[PDB]
Amino acid sequence: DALWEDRDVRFDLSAQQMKTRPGEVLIDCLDSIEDTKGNNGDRGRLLVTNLRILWHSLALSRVNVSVGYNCILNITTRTANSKLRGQTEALYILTKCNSTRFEFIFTNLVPGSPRLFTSVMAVHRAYETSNKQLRLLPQEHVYDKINGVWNLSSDQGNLGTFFITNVRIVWHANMNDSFNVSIPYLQIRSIKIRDSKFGLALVIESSQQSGGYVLGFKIDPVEKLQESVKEINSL
């Protein structure tokens, strides 16, 4: 139960269906599959999304466990069924990180979902495929252009150029090497201003990374630090 996310209590389900996360898009959903090497029984439903691939039970759906695209390495098919009551059904499981293996056997689907496999190749693929002009992500735009910022690293600080985007909040330095320093907004948890410490700066409280990245704005009369904290606390 190390990559089974909890659903009965942590997703607060009824007796029949899952609970959808914000921004989670559904494509297909089916039934009558077997799980092995979890902590479960023998039969239940099967749901899929753009962030999780979900097994709903049949008997006791107050035990219902799944995993998503954050942990899957690659996926397999069996073959196209040659003749006389075969199937195309194969769900075989490659964990990215841990040594747990799984086999998903649809117990009684009659064509075994040959067209759901035509979908599931692309939805893993989207999670696969993910001078100062930004390497811009799709569904992302630039909302501020700031020249002359002294980001002060643990090594040293230098002349730089800052951008404020929708998601990937990056910083460029034009000091002889074209640095890449980029954080996403979802890794940002909280923000504080440091006017006195290190000269009119902001510090970044990261949850997962557990580190702090600063910038620098005492280098010019800038009138943009109060512009900054509004955009980044909102978005």
Author numbering: 5 to 134, 149 to 253
What text comes from the article?
It binds with its cargo to the intraflagellar transport (IFT) complex, a large heterooligomeric protein complex that is transported along ciliary microtubules by the molecular motors dynein and kinesin. Here we report the structure of the human BBSome core complex at an average resolution of 3.8 Å for BBS1, 4, 8, 9, and 18 and 4.3 Å for BBS5.
In addition, the resolution is limited in this region, indicating a high degree of conformational flexibility. After three-dimensional sorting we also resolved BBS5 at a resolution of 4.3 Å and combined its density with the reconstruction of the full data set to build an atomic model. One of the PH domains also interacts with BBS8 and with an unstructured loop of BBS9. The observed dynamic properties of BBS5 are probably the prerequisite for the subunit to be able to reorient and position one or both of its PH domains closer to the membrane, thereby enabling interaction with the membrane.
